[PDB]
Design a protein around this ligand. Structure first.
Ligand SMILES: OC[C@H]1O[C@H](O[C@H]2[C@H](O)[C@@H](O)[C@@H](O)O[C@@H]2CO)[C@H](O)[C@@H](O)[C@@H]1O
Ligand code: NA
Length: 533
């Protein structure tokens, strides 16, 4: 239960939350309404977890790319600003927050990654990625690194991966093709390979994360970093004489950052919706409110035209917008979280050597395709008494009691059902007949699974049959995600898929919910069979 007569606001810890709390203060002074601003960790995951139960903040700040998924899960109030208010913001910002024709958040600012360089160490920064190793080699001799940036978050490495041809979902003539994913093409492989080569040749470290990179640049130990506008404040506090510029090219093509619009959404369960709209339209999105935030940590190019004409004088904003033009605004579609989780794991696995480049990107492509199809609730037709957690837990313990041979025999039959409604329906008829009759018939003798339902005394174990019927009911819920589950089984990458399916489930373990639950069941069962308990 969110508390009436109060505003609670979540925003990321790298953003200007103290600035925002200043606006919160002004609001209370004018209206007597208390505003509390918080910066929880993992906010983008935590929000949909608490909001799914009707709890959480009244207001949520994140880049626009998450909001479509929140909207599809019913977690956000529809935003309806008057036309007089809308015309004050850049129209491309409203686009970023428009989902299936409705506005699902207020746009705040545009953020793009830039190349940030130390002027004293590197008066003329490199224009190509290809120069960097030689440059690092020379700087290392003098006790400095050429480039350090967060390799843990794919937001940071995606610009190199996209440069020669990687993409998330194909975008043609104003429409995204969620069935055409660009994660394992030649261009993405070339970029990720360049990155992994930098690591292997000791120009960067696989474990470099946000705070390490920040500290190194700000303490003058590295000539370059890659970061957003929010980072400029800490650099201002430090000794460093820095510039902000276009990212280096790769194979003669520009680095293509995914560009975010920081946005503010209103919790669908909030009992203070009118107060939130009032705080956002009349306090935050004003010259004065944006200035308070921007002076704590810079926002980038703000959505409010009146204040952005001031900020556009800064050449750091020009560089931000130069990179923004070379990159692409992210989609706000639910499938974005799928893309992100897949790419995140791939880059980390490739960087650390846990997977090769080709293998990391082939698995990511498979997972993103599977999860994208699951999140696409549209155009589906299904024709021609226990907790879902409870059922999976039951099913898994039954299969755990099997011998290993019997597990593989179950798996042989189930893998044949994937993508084949005829085979699935037939196995369902047979398992069900065996369950009633307690006997195997002649047409059962070539189905390994069906003998697997019997113990070494030749007697049927009813719970094995029921577990299988439960799996085949779940598999029916799935449409085209089935073929990607097969690929993952064939390539040995089900554990990545299971992990990614869990991360995508907004809630802790709704049409979106039914399908992903089913997908999690199917993947979990296949993994237990393929790799053991
Ligand atoms: O790394 C994947 C991640 O990218 C973006 O997250 C950014 C965010 O947009 C910035 O505002 C800032 O907080 O840095 C984050 C990277 O750590 C996407 O917005 C997010 O959905 C995605 O998971
Ligand atoms: Na562009």
């Amino acid at each position: 239960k969110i508390e009436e007569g109060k505003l609670v606001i979540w925003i990321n810890g790298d953003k200007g939350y103290n600035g925002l709390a200043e606006v919160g203060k002004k609001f209370e002074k004018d209206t007597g309404i208390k505003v509390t601003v918080e910066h929880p960790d993992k906010l983008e995951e935590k929000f949909p977890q608490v909001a799914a139960t009707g709890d959480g903040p009244d207001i949520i700040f994140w880049a626009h790319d998450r909001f479509g998924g929140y909207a599809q899960s019913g977690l956000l109030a529809e935003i309806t600003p008057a036309a007089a208010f809308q015309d004050k913001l850049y129209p491309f910002t409203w686009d970023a927050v428009r989902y299936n024709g409705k506005l699902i958040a207020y746009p705040i600012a545009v953020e793009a990654l830039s190349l940030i360089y130390n002027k004293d160490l590197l008066p003329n920064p490199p224009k190509t990625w290809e120069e960097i190793p030689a440059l690092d080699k020379e700087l290392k001799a003098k006790g400095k690194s050429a480039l350090m940036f967060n390799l843990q978050e794919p937001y940071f490495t995606w610009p190199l991966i996209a440069a020669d041809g990687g993409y998330a979902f194909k975008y043609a003539a104003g429409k995204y093709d969620i069935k055409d994913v660009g994660v394992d093409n030649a261009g993405a492989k070339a970029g990720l390979t360049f990155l992994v080569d930098l690591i292997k040749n000791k120009h960067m470290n696989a474990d470099t994360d946000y705070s390490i990179a920040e500290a190194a640049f700000n303490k003058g130990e590295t000539a370059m970093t890659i970061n957003g506008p929010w980072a400029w404040s800490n650099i201002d506090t430090s000794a460093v004489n820095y510039g902000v510029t276009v990212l280096p090219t790769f194979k003669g093509q520009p680095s293509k950052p995914f560009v975010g619009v920081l946005s503010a959404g209103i919790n669908a369960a909030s009992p203070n919706k009118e107060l939130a709209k009032e705080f956002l339209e009349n306090y935050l999105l004003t010259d004065e409110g944006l200035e308070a935030v921007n002076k704590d940590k810079p926002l980038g190019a703000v959505a409010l035209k009146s204040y952005e004409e001031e900020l556009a004088k800064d050449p750091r904003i020009a560089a931000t917008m130069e990179n923004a033009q070379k990159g692409e605004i992210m989609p706000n579609i639910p499938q974005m979280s799928a893309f992100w989780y897949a790419v995140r794991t791939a880059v980390i696995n490739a960087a650390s050597g846990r997977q090769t480049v080709d293998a990391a990107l082939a698995a990511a492509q498979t997972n993103a395709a599977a999860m994208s199809a699951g999140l696409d609730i549209h155009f589906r037709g299904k024709t021609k008494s226990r907790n879902m957690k409870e059922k999976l837990e039951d099913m898994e313990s039954v299969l755990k009691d099997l011998t290993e041979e019997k597990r593989k025999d179950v798996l042989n039959s189930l893998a044949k059902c994937l993508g084949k409604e005829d085979i699935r329906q037939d196995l369902e008829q047979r398992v069900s007949e065996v369950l009633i009759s307690r006997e195997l018939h002649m047409e059962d003798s070539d189905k390994p699974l069906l003998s697997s339902l019997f113990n070494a005394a030749g007697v049927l174990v009813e719970a094995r049959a029921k577990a299988i019927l439960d799996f085949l009911d779940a598999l029916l819920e799935l449409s085209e995600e089935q073929q990607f589950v097969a690929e993952a089984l064939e390539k040995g990458t089900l554990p990545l898929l299971k992990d990614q399916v869990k991360s995508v489930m907004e809630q802790n373990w709704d049409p979106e919910a039914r399908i992903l639950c089913a997908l999690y069941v199917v993947v979990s069962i296949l993994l237990e069979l393929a790799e053991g308990p």
